[PDB]
Amino acid sequence: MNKEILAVVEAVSNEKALPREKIFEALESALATATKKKYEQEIDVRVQIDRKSGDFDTFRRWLVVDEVTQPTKEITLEAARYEDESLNLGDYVEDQIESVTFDRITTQTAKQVIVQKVREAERAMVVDQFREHEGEIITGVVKKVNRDNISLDLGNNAEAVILREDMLPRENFRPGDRVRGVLYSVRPEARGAQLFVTRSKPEMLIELFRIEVPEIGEEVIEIKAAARDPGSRAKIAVKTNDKRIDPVGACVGMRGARVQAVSTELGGERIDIVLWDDNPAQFVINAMAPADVASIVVDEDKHTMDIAVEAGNLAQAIGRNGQNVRLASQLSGWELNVMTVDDLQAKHQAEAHAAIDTFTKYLDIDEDFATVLVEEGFSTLEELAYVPMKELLEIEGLDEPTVEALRERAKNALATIAQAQEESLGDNKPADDLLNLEGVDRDLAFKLAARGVCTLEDLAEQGIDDLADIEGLTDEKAGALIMAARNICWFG
Amino acid sequence: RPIGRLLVDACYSPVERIAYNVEAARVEQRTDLDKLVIEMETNGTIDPEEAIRRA
Amino acid sequence: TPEEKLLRAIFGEKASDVKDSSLRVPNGVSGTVIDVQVFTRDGVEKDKRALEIEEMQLKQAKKDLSEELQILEAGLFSRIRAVLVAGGVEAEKLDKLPRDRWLELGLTDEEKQNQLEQLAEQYDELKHEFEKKLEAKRRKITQGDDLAPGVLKIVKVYLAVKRRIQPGDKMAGRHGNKGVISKINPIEDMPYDENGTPV
Amino acid sequence: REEAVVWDILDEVIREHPVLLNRAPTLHRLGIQAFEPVLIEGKAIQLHPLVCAAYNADFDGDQMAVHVPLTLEAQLEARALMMSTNNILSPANGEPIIVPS
Amino acid sequence: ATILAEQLEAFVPEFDPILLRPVDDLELTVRSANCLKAEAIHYIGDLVQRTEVELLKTPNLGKKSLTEIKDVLASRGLSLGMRLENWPPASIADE
Amino acid sequence: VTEFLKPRLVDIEQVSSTHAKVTLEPLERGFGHTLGNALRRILLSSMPGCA
DNA sequence: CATGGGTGCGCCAGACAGGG
DNA sequence: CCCTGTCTGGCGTCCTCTCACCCCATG
Ligand SMILES: [Mg+2]
């Protein structure tokens, strides 16, 4: 009876490595809840278990509050202090109540609350101790297969889930099968599956390589990037600081044994291992393997790279359904355009001709001088307007007066282009002039400007009949806007 | 719900005895017309024209 | 289970393997509980409702014997008023004094003072009889009852069903015309006559 | 509890499942006949009148027992041998037993 | 049906009136009602102006009777410490 | 209180030709007879025609 | 406590005496 | 042994629904 409480507390404390205090607090809450259910009225109840005897006293708790909303469970601070002057806001006033007679109902409730406390203590500490597993490749047994997810048993009442998107496209699991996967997220669904496991994401590939390649687990080789088409093909980029170690050779292993072990665990996924380079162009050449790259052109402003390949290698460089270029682009972070050497030259000639036409049209220069600007690397009016004067003065035949005139023309061309578009639609010119009339939304200003009504004066000159075909403009609203425009233009 | 209520049966019915007696009509010069005379028997809770209108 | 044998830990008793189960009753009949009797073999602790029924029947028998004394005393005083209409009548002096002394008024040795002495004999007999009978009735309510071998208390409950009529009951006249009532028609379908009344 | 959904379940199992009605003094074989149930608001077996002349059943307080053929061969024996449409001639002679009474 | 239907177309600021009630109408325990009467609290409008801290100073008013008063006031949508401007109305000042 | 079970012709099983069988449900515990009797008496005579 | 010892039915039918 | 009278056994409709009461006795 008495000594049995101590023996149970000691057995549970030792078996679940849990603080005795946390078990008692929970038993007190369990007994309070079991007591509340025996009364027809909603009462507040505190239970206190004596830590030496295992005896327990049950109260009618009265949550000391400032304002009473529930007179059956709450008492004012003034009324609580009339019974005991030591009480504060948030304390409990008690009332001699028959201690909940333990039988089989209280016993089952106590068991359930202990089990729940162990899930939030023993199992929580087990998950904390398995900080590596929360991130590394956990191993589970398939408990249940649904259409949309697989429930894994990890042991110790821990359940994990693999979602349909987190599976490989050709995997078929049965109840009782062993499955490995990366624990990529821990949420708070204690009841059920709080653990989310992936086999499809790139982290599964990284951690399989960490286990299979000791040099990655020892931090001698680093995986810098991983790009993956799950169950089909992946690319990994590897670097080492030790010049004595070939990082690609280490990840492949003797006759490919290491990469084949990882591929086999991923259902026969093809894995390319590439050397990481700190030069983006050299890294993209490595990422494009097994296709040979002839030339690369880098557009830093668009964050894009044009990759020229021999006409025989084009199909290999793109890969089946663009898989090779897509995985290389995901691995590099660059947008990758794969074309032939002939197509790259034709593209550059078309861009050079478009730049020459743009410069000839807007800068009032001859085609010979526009060609020199494009040969010196200028492709946009913005570059010519904003580039440091020193770079323009390095061009053979440019003097300081001609560079100043060229920049002034480029700025005036940029200004004119912006103003023209802003007046054609409703970007700025018609979004201020035509939209001056109270009531003009940006859409209506662009609809007006599409009819050639670009200014508040142009609107003041219109009839209702001239605007009657504008979708969303009633004759009354047209008349009001024309009168508002006339009031500002002719009577302001 | 408490033990102090007492439930009686509910005869929601105001009428007791409805008897129609068809008979010949002479008000209209045209013959072969009929008059329908309905003697109802209400318990006072329903007006007779309201009863024939609801029916 | 460990938790079943942990009944001792929080409280005591012993183990919970024993099938906990409350004698619940079967179906087929409605009703309204009109009367509950509780009989207790003597020695057994009366619970709170058996003491409630004991106080209730003590109160009922107390009120009933007190009303026996009051009603028969009212008849006796009506007899005294009927006798004292003649022979030393007091029309105003009769209700000035308390009613239990209607004997020492002015009246000689006649049949009327003899009759008032006989009614005083009857009245004192009713007084001492009421004392001894209320003591005996408290004894009858308070005592236990001899019962079956090895029974603590008997609870008897009287359900009072109200069974109306339905297709399947048996009605019959007084000549042998039996019959299972077969269909409980509406009012309108009945054959009526040229007055209006349905059969 | 008899919820609202078990009565549709009941009209599913009663359908095409005969029952053996039986008058208590069964003398000949026409005193056990198989019917199909039609559900009754009530507490009394409604019995088709012509069939009464087979059971010697008037309606002066008579009682009958119902039996359920459980297995599948017994449902087929109730429909194919003991159905009330199949007993229209008395086996003692050639006279019809579904005579209007 | 058309014939039969055509043959039938000729037929077919001190709160409200609750503040003016006496405290005895609140169904309070005989203890709570007698404690309020001892402090000259006669109307519900007088009770609603008093704070919980003021009611606890009243002789013989316990924490239990204060909880009863709150639960009863809450059942009528009233709370302790409401300020009524112009209470008591001149209609009550003459009793 | 004036809300009844408004009925409808769930089917018109017109058997063969010049012959139909029109079933109407659901009516009150007593309105099948009054609508059958009203429609039966009106169709019999009131309904006009030429012969 | 544990054990210990009425007299209103009537027919059929075959086995057992009982004359014969 | 061949018939006659007696003596015992074997048997007598089916379903149901309540009720009441089941061994003293005692050294
Ligand atoms: Mg019969």
Window 153-192 of C: residues touching D by CB (8 A cutoff) are 166-168, 170, 178-180, 182
How close, in Å, is residue E38 to chain A by CA atoms?
A: 19
- Cβ atoms of A217 and A210 closer than 8 Å: yes
Nearest CA among F2, F3, F1, F5 for reference residue F31 = F5
Angle at E9 between CA E4 and CA E12, to 5 degrees: 115
Ligand 1 center from residue D55 Cα (angstroms): 9
Q: Is the dihedral of CA E46, E51, E53, E56 positive or negative?
A: positive
- Our measurement of CA E67 to C1' G17, in angstroms, reads 110
CB-contacted nucleotides of strand H (7 Å): 13-16
Q: Is A312 exposed, middle or buried (0-12, 13-18, 19+ CB in 10 A)?
A: exposed
For the domain that residue C74 is a member of, what is the CATH number? 6.10.140.1670
**Contact at CB, A71 and E74, closer than 8 angstroms:** yes
For the domain that residue E19 is a member of, what is the CATH number? 1.10.150.20
**Rounded to whole angstroms, how far apart are CA atoms A98 and A118?**
29
In this structure, what token pair is assigned to residue A123? 């199992």
Question: Could you give the count of Cα atoms lying within 13 Å of D65 in the half-sphere of its Cβ?
Answer: 9
- Our measurement of CA C91 to C1' G10, in angstroms, reads 91
Angle at A456 between CA A450 and CA A461, to 5 degrees: 85
Residue C189: list chain F partners with CB under 8 A: 30, 33
**Rounded to whole angstroms, how far apart are CA atoms A428 and A455?**
11
**Rounded to whole angstroms, how far apart are CA atoms C192 and A312?**
107
Using CA atoms, how far residue E7 sits from B6, B30, B35, E4, E10, in Å, is 47, 19, 14, 5, 8
Please tell me if residue F30 touches chain C, with a CB cutoff of 8 Å: yes
Ligand 1 center from residue D57 Cα (angstroms): 5
Using CA atoms, how far residue D14 sits from C75, C147, D21, D37, D70, in Å, is 74, 52, 15, 6, 12
How far the first Cα of chain B sits from its last, in Å, is 37
How far the first Cα of chain C sits from its last, in Å, is 72
In this structure, what token pair is assigned to residue A447? 């609809």
**Rounded to whole angstroms, how far apart are CA atoms C107 and C114?**
11
- Residue count of chain A, please give it: 492
User: Cβ–Cβ contacts within 10 Å for residue F17, how many?
Assistant: 6
Task: Establish whether chain C is in contact with chain E, requiring a minimum of 3 CB pairs below 8 angstroms.
Answer: no
Picking from D39, D59, D64 by the largest number of C CB atoms within 10 A of its own CB, the best residue to mutate is D59
Pairing outcome for strands A195-198 and A47-49: unpaired
- Cβ atoms of E46 and A71 closer than 8 Å: no
**Rounded to whole angstroms, how far apart are CA atoms E73 and E51?**
13
Q: What is the resolution of this structure in A?
A: 4.5
**Rounded to whole angstroms, how far apart are CA atoms A307 and A296?**
5
Residue C8: list chain A partners with CB under 8 A: 1, 4
**Of C166, C167, C178, which is closest to D60 when you measure between CB atoms?**
C178
The answer to whether some atom of strand H lies closer than 7 Å to the beta carbon of D25 is yes
The answer to whether some atom of strand H lies closer than 7 Å to the beta carbon of D71 is no
The chains found to touch F (3+ Cβ pairs under 8 angstroms) are C, E
Contacts of A170 (CB under 8 A, 6+ apart): A231, A267
Q: Please, which contacts does A289-293 make with residues 24 or more away whose CB atoms are closer than 8 Å?
A: A290/A316, A291/A316, A291/A317, A291/A324, A293/A317
Ligand 1 center from residue C29 Cα (angstroms): 28
- Our measurement of CA D36 to C1' H12, in angstroms, reads 39
Residue of chain C whose alpha carbon sits nearest to that of A8: C9
Using CA atoms, how far residue B17 sits from A203, E75, F44, in Å, is 89, 50, 29
Please tell me if residue E3 touches chain F, with a CB cutoff of 8 Å: yes
The chains found to touch B (3+ Cβ pairs under 8 angstroms) are C, E
C57 lies in which domain range? 45-144
Nearest CA among A246, A236, A337 for reference residue A283 = A236
- Cβ atoms of A435 and A442 closer than 8 Å: yes
**Rounded to whole angstroms, how far apart are CA atoms A205 and A182?**
9
Please tell me if residue C189 touches chain B, with a CB cutoff of 8 Å: no
Residue ranges of alpha helices (H) inside chain B are: 48-54
- Our measurement of CA D27 to C1' G11, in angstroms, reads 26
Longest dimension (CA), chain D: 51
Contacts of D24 (CB under 8 A, 6+ apart): D63, D64, D65
Please tell me if residue C48 touches chain D, with a CB cutoff of 8 Å: no
How close, in Å, is residue B49 to chain E by CA atoms?
A: 9
Write out the residues surrounding ion ligand 1, Cβ under 5 A.
D 58, 62
Residue E12: list chain B partners with CB under 8 A: 53
Task: Establish whether chain A is in contact with chain C, requiring a minimum of 3 CB pairs below 8 angstroms.
Answer: yes
How close, in Å, is residue A45 to chain E by CA atoms?
A: 17
Residue of chain C whose alpha carbon sits nearest to that of B20: C196
- Cβ atoms of A69 and A26 closer than 8 Å: no
- Our measurement of CA C150 to C1' H26, in angstroms, reads 22
Compute CA C69 distance to the chain's CA centroid, rounded to the nearest angstrom.
18
**Rounded to whole angstroms, how far apart are CA atoms A447 and A434?**
10
**Rounded to whole angstroms, how far apart are CA atoms D36 and D21?**
10
- DSSP characters for A425-475? TTSSSTTTTGGGSTT--HHHHHHHHHTT--SHHHHHT--HHHHTTSTT--H
**Rounded to whole angstroms, how far apart are CA atoms D94 and A347?**
108
The answer to whether some atom of strand H lies closer than 7 Å to the beta carbon of D63 is yes
Residue A8, phi then psi, degrees to nearest 5 = -70, -45
Q: What are the start-end ranges of the E strands in F1-51? A: 8-12, 22-25
**Rounded to whole angstroms, how far apart are CA atoms D98 and D95?**
9
Pairing outcome for strands A304-309 and A295-299: antiparallel
- DSSP characters for D16-79? T--EEEEESS--SGGGEEEE-----SSSS----HHHHHHHT--SSS--EEEE---SHHHHHHHH
In this structure, what token pair is assigned to residue B45? 């809770």
- Our measurement of CA D24 to C1' H8, in angstroms, reads 38
User: Cβ–Cβ contacts within 10 Å for residue C77, how many?
Assistant: 15
Residues of D marked as binding for Mg(2+)?
Answer: 58, 60, 62
Q: Is C92 helix (H, G, I), strand (E, B) or coil?
A: coil
Window 101-130 of A: residues touching C by CB (8 A cutoff) are 101-104, 106-108, 110-111
**Rounded to whole angstroms, how far apart are CA atoms D84 and C7?**
64
Which nucleotide lies nearest residue D27, CA to C1'?
H14
- Cβ atoms of A305 and A259 closer than 8 Å: no
The chains found to touch C (3+ Cβ pairs under 8 angstroms) are A, B, D, F
E29 lies in which domain range? 13-89
In this structure, what token pair is assigned to residue A433? 């002039």
Q: Which helix (H) or strand (E) holds E13?
A: none
Q: Is the dihedral of CA A278, A279, A283, A286 positive or negative?
A: negative
**Rounded to whole angstroms, how far apart are CA atoms A315 and A327?**
15
Rg (CA), chain F: 14
Which nucleotide lies nearest residue D26, CA to C1'?
H14
Q: Which residues pair with A183 in a beta bridge?
A: A197
**Rounded to whole angstroms, how far apart are CA atoms E65 and E43?**
17
- Our measurement of CA D36 to C1' H19, in angstroms, reads 38
Compute CA A162 distance to the chain's CA centroid, rounded to the nearest angstrom.
19
